[PDB]
Design an enzyme around this catalytic site. Sequence first.
Site, PDB file in Angstrom:
ATOM      1  N   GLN D 765       0.844  -1.182   0.000  1.00 37.63           N
ATOM      2  CA  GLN D 765       0.000   0.000   0.000  1.00 37.63           C
ATOM      3  C   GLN D 765       0.888   1.244   0.000  1.00 37.63           C
ATOM      4  O   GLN D 765       2.101   1.167  -0.217  1.00 37.63           O
ATOM      5  CB  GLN D 765      -0.947  -0.029   1.199  1.00 37.63           C
ATOM      6  CG  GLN D 765      -1.735  -1.324   1.341  1.00 37.63           C
ATOM      7  CD  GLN D 765      -2.206  -1.877   0.011  1.00 37.63           C
ATOM      8  OE1 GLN D 765      -2.928  -1.211  -0.732  1.00 37.63           O
ATOM      9  NE2 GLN D 765      -1.797  -3.102  -0.299  1.00 37.63           N
ATOM     10  N   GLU D 766       0.288   2.412   0.238  1.00 35.87           N
ATOM     11  CA  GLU D 766       1.069   3.643   0.285  1.00 35.87           C
ATOM     12  C   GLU D 766       2.196   3.538   1.306  1.00 35.87           C
ATOM     13  O   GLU D 766       3.314   4.009   1.058  1.00 35.87           O
ATOM     14  CB  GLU D 766       0.160   4.828   0.610  1.00 35.87           C
ATOM     15  CG  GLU D 766       0.798   6.187   0.357  1.00 35.87           C
ATOM     16  CD  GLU D 766       1.545   6.721   1.564  1.00 35.87           C
ATOM     17  OE1 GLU D 766       1.041   6.565   2.697  1.00 35.87           O
ATOM     18  OE2 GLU D 766       2.637   7.297   1.381  1.00 35.87           O
ATOM     19  N   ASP D 767       1.924   2.929   2.454  1.00 30.79           N
ATOM     20  CA  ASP D 767       2.920   2.706   3.498  1.00 30.79           C
ATOM     21  C   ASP D 767       3.239   1.214   3.547  1.00 30.79           C
ATOM     22  O   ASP D 767       2.725   0.483   4.399  1.00 30.79           O
ATOM     23  CB  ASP D 767       2.411   3.222   4.852  1.00 30.79           C
ATOM     24  CG  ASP D 767       2.708   4.693   5.066  1.00 30.79           C
ATOM     25  OD1 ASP D 767       3.033   5.388   4.080  1.00 30.79           O
ATOM     26  OD2 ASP D 767       2.611   5.154   6.223  1.00 30.79           O
ATOM     27  N   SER D 768       4.097   0.768   2.632  1.00 23.80           N
ATOM     28  CA  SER D 768       4.494  -0.631   2.562  1.00 23.80           C
ATOM     29  C   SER D 768       5.568  -0.771   1.494  1.00 23.80           C
ATOM     30  O   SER D 768       5.872   0.176   0.763  1.00 23.80           O
ATOM     31  CB  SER D 768       3.303  -1.542   2.250  1.00 23.80           C
ATOM     32  OG  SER D 768       3.643  -2.905   2.434  1.00 23.80           O
ATOM     33  N   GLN D 903       8.497   8.413   3.340  1.00 20.26           N
ATOM     34  CA  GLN D 903       7.985   7.748   4.528  1.00 20.26           C
ATOM     35  C   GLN D 903       8.463   6.301   4.581  1.00 20.26           C
ATOM     36  O   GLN D 903       8.528   5.605   3.565  1.00 20.26           O
ATOM     37  CB  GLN D 903       6.458   7.790   4.552  1.00 20.26           C
ATOM     38  CG  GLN D 903       5.854   7.233   5.830  1.00 20.26           C
ATOM     39  CD  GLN D 903       4.353   7.424   5.901  1.00 20.26           C
ATOM     40  OE1 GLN D 903       3.736   7.930   4.966  1.00 20.26           O
ATOM     41  NE2 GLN D 903       3.758   7.016   7.015  1.00 20.26           N
TER      42      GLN D 903
END
Lengths: 51, 129, 65, 1023, 114, 151
Positions: D765-768, D903
């Site tokens: 996902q966006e954070d992965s 991030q």
Amino acid sequence: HTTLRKVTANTAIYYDPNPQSTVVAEDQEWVNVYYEMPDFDVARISPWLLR
Amino acid sequence: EEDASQLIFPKEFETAETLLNSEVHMLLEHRKQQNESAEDEQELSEVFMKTLNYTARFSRFKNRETIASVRSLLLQKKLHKFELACLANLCPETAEESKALIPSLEGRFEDEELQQILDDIQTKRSFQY
Amino acid sequence: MIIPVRCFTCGKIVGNKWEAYLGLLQAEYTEGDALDALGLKRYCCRRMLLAHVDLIEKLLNYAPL
Amino acid sequence: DEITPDLWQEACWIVISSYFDEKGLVRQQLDSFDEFIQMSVQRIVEDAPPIDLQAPPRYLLKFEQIYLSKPTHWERDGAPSPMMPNEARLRNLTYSAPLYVDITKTVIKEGEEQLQTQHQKTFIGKIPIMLRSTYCLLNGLTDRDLCELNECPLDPGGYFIINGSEKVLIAQEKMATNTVYVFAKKDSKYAYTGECRSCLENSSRPTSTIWVSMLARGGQGAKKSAIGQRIVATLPYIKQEVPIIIVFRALGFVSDRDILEHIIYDFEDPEMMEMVKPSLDEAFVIQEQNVALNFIGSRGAKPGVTKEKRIKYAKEVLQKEMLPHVGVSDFCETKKAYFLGYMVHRLLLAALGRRELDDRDHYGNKRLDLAGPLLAFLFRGMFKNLLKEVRIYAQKFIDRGKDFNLELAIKTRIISDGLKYSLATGNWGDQKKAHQARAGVSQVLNRLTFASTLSHLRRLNSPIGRDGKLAKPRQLHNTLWGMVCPAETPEGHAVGLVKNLALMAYISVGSQPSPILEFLEEWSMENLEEISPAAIADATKIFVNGCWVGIHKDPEQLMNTLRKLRRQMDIIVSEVSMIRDIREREIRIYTDAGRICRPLLIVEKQKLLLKKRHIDQLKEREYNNYSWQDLVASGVVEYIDTLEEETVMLAMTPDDLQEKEVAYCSTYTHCEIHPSMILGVCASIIPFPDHNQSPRNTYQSAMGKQAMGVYITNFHVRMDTLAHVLYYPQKPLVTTRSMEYLRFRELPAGINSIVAIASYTGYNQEDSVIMNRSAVDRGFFRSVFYRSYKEQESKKGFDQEEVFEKPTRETCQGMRHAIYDKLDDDGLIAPGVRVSGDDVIIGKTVTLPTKRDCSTFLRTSETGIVDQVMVTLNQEGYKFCKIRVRSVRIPQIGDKFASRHGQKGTCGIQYRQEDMPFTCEGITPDIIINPHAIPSRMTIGHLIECLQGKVSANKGEIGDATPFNDAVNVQKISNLLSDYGYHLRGNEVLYNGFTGRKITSQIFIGPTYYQRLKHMVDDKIHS
Amino acid sequence: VGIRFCQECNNMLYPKEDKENRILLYACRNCDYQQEADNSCIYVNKITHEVDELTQIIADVSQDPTLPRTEDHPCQKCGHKEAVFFQSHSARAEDAMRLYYVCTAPHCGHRWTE
Amino acid sequence: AKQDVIEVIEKAHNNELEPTPGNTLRQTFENQVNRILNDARDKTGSSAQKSLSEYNNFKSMVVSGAKGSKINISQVIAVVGQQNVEGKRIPFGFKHRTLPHFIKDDYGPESRGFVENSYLAGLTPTEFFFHAMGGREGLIDTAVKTAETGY
Ligand SMILES: [Zn+2]
Ligand SMILES: [Zn+2]
Ligand SMILES: [Zn+2]
């Protein structure tokens, strides 16, 4: 709400010994005619001013 | 059956007057001075020493003049005696901080006037450095 | 610390190439020219040699127990 | 001759290389401590008040001189054996050096016979020594010697080791002293504040601040409205606000005209004259000076019972308490009045609006307190208490009539423990004093990564209290350009309060202003005491450290002469800064410490003073006895502070000033060597930060510190509670020029990866992020973990004591179910034994009044092997041991990986080489990131870095990551890539591992640098 | 509007009015000395305070290198092309936007506004 | 846009510009310059959206509306835009100048923080600091926004 400060340009305290002196030269022309009528002139007037 | 937030506590404490952490240090110092030299008596109890460090570490004022000025300043208002020491001891940074920490103040103090009181305490409290 | 044995991407051996890589650098050969001589056509392996630092040299300065 | 623009790029970086070679990265830490330990410590002892004891027998004790020896360790034998810095950490004892003071006592017993004795090198106490300082054991040592002592040559030092913990004194910004500031507050009862905190040299008395306020026109009254706005000044020891006019009367200027002379310099101007008229009305009734002194003493803190005492108290307050810096004697009335009049004059300009209000966030108005200035204030706390202990101890002895031995009088514990206490806990100052200590100072040094260590040493702290509260320290100001890194700032509630020093910027160590003061006298400068007030109307005011030295007839000639001396390293040191407020006819010279300044190339007549010959010598800087200091000597480069920067024109690059079609400015005074130096240690390592978003650059500053890697070289010898070291920390393919000075190339904290930006199986996902299982099996991101366990067997009680032995089930009554076969006959597990789960690694028992087991088990359930075991004796002499448990962590689905910018992304899934999408040439990406991150919480620099990495690897050349280098461009990189049979934009055709059919979209794959963050799943779950 | 000091004690001369001669004279209080005032004006107060900034601008700003320089407007009494210009530094006039020019000659120090 | 801003500055410099009745001269000038810079970002940004082809991946994200926004593409391709601080342009931290490099009392695009370079092209040294100032305000607002909103 508007105060005298927002509508006023400048102020000063001038000295005039007698009521007819009007040491200020520029205003002498118009103050004379207005002051001919003895309005509040029934007695002595202080020689100070708040023009 | 007692709660500080709702200003409910035993009736005996009503007559008592609250004290500041820095101010108590002065009283403890006065007690410490006489015991150490004035009279030859056993060493002070461990409880006395523990609170002395607590007051010294959290002391928000240098001298009596600063303590008196804050006490006098807060006395002029309708601040309750319980809040008198609580507000000074906590030293809330802003008005919103004090009301949440002290629910009582929200009852009779506005968001503006109290802010003018906390900032006054800030001008009085000083740091070591 | 030390050069890895093989490329993490494909698996080509790169540890043995480190010794020749340094030897070629002092032989007036360019940084990229040395890689071609060792036979690193893929850019994944060239990374393991071009941009690798051998920290064990400084650790060996300290005396052992 | 001249530096051609085609050669300026290499030339500009050469001078920067010399600056770091000579100065370094921690020069600001070391210099301040060196000044503190060389002069400030001597000044405190020398400036001490005489010690007088009485009860006929008069005792006068004076400290003659202070002697400091190199660090030594005092064991039970007491021999002065040298104490290596490394030994301090291992033995968990403070690294410090003894302090010795010469004490001379004169005793008179009313017998008209004076005799004195000499005490040579009295053991006053000891002073912690900053590492790599002048008094440190590792000063001027070659790199070979440092290794012999188990110390990292690359370690810059600049910290204190207290109880085995490395502490860094965080610089605390404070409002500048001896400076007049006029601020406007809408909450105060008065319109304007004449705040000016005045203090003497480095420190003689506690700082005293006076606020010359001006009452607001909002209030209305019978007499208040007539006079209107009047000036009121509050004295430091006077509770009430007394009119400023009365203060001058107390000084001695009874005549009212003299009052106007010192305040109003231009009598021709009537606007300022009318403002001072109301202030005279309040003070008019007070005509005589004695009455003015009586008036001030009336509201004193401790008013005197008798009338005459009020005058004396007021006389002392104004003479000593008020304006100490301008004068401390009793014959400085004229000097004190002139400064007082200037404060009123500054207020008049601000009130009329002809002078801009001082900026709260202006760093020129803020001073930085380093380990030197900080410890200098602390040293007085113990020394002042030291005199009291001697006085109190002698008091009982003196009244009895017998002489008191000094050996007992001097207290070593206060000096030793006093400094050690705050430096360890972090609560500044003495705990006994009834006050609130300033926490957050002397924090534990962050040794997770070398870059983090460098950033922590150069770390800065915003002011706390009223100063910080009123201002906006969090907001980024313009003054930070080239002095404090803008991008670097911790994320959270305390955002912007904590910052880092700029790479080139350094804080002034400090110097005596006496050489500057003497210089003015021999020139046309004339002091105030000689001239009449009328001469100040046209002349320019001269200030030295905020002191009223005197006006000068011609400002241009003096400043040009002053500038020449600064460039020539004459009596005026290059550190000293001269500020010329042309619009105010004020020349300010500052010599005190805490002034942040940065070097700048000097430009004369639109021509750089740095010529080719200067660069030629720098190119051969080694073996030629040439260094950075020579450049300042020749006058090519000088230093500009924040205040001087206000009146110093700057140019980004020589190309801007050499010539332009339309002249933006035809008068350039200074030119920046290279704009990229504004970045800090953590921000410098970022390529194309300009291409990156500001929050992303700030976010990296936090992530960079959290990155795990080789922090130092001598990690095996030392013992740290937490230390993560990477298996294969390799230098990046895309590196910045400033990276060389940070030494991050030698000790990197990440491993480059061929990253293909694609959505594979929807597991990211966006954070992965998706990793390659086969790569990890080859050592893709594996790292070690060290946890040090410490324990000591001490005889705290006479009956009960701790011992090290095997806790046998029989001899021990109370114990916890665990395996004890690991422990040896000495109770310590030998190195090389695997430990897993709940296991005892050190045996300790207490002989309670039969013994109770109190051993220490593993903090977590992780499986690790003990690396090394150390047995020592603590400072108390009891047996003390340390053991480092080493465990191996393999990257898994729960580990968090973060790029150099953006991030952090958790490893969503690990795929074998077969499952990963291979390209035509058979290159399965090591890591796959979600393309949906690039738009918002990422930067185009990732794509540019990938393009540069592909070109760098293919061409076999490390790419340049200069933020503002016009040579490097996206189009240029694309053209280079096309020459090696690759897509100009870096896109490649990736064949899906599961199904061999070509993917419709062509993936973008490149060798992007990546770093492993300390956040790991194993630590969380094992807890 | 101005301030005058007496010759005896050099103190403030507050405006005082006499009833006999009917003349305003500036008289000190502590000392008996009193002097007549020929201006016949006590003070003035410009509420809008539209005071010309030319008198406030200092001529020594010519050598300032940071101030911008433009050759379009030459000095009136010199003819020198170079002329340093800048905006009003007064907070009162911050509302308005104007340019003030100063001659760049070493000794002229002429200030004018277009 | 840059030329238009200079023309507006010239009008105010010569006192030719007339303030609106509902605003003062200093604030009116700040409003006129802001619109010129704001309009340029939107116009150039809108052209960037039309520039992207169907095959382009940047267009696919915004077209579906999944992630990102048209403004993000504008800052990457066309122009980052003005870097406002505290709701206004970059203040004069120094004496009437945003940074030492710019001349005193400079109200031009570059001086006051207008970033005319996209992220891909690369920002000038002056623009980088101005961009940092704008980003710092957002981080501070974000840090306090969560604390207040959670309350
Ligand atoms: Zn490979
Ligand atoms: Zn008089
Ligand atoms: Zn002229």
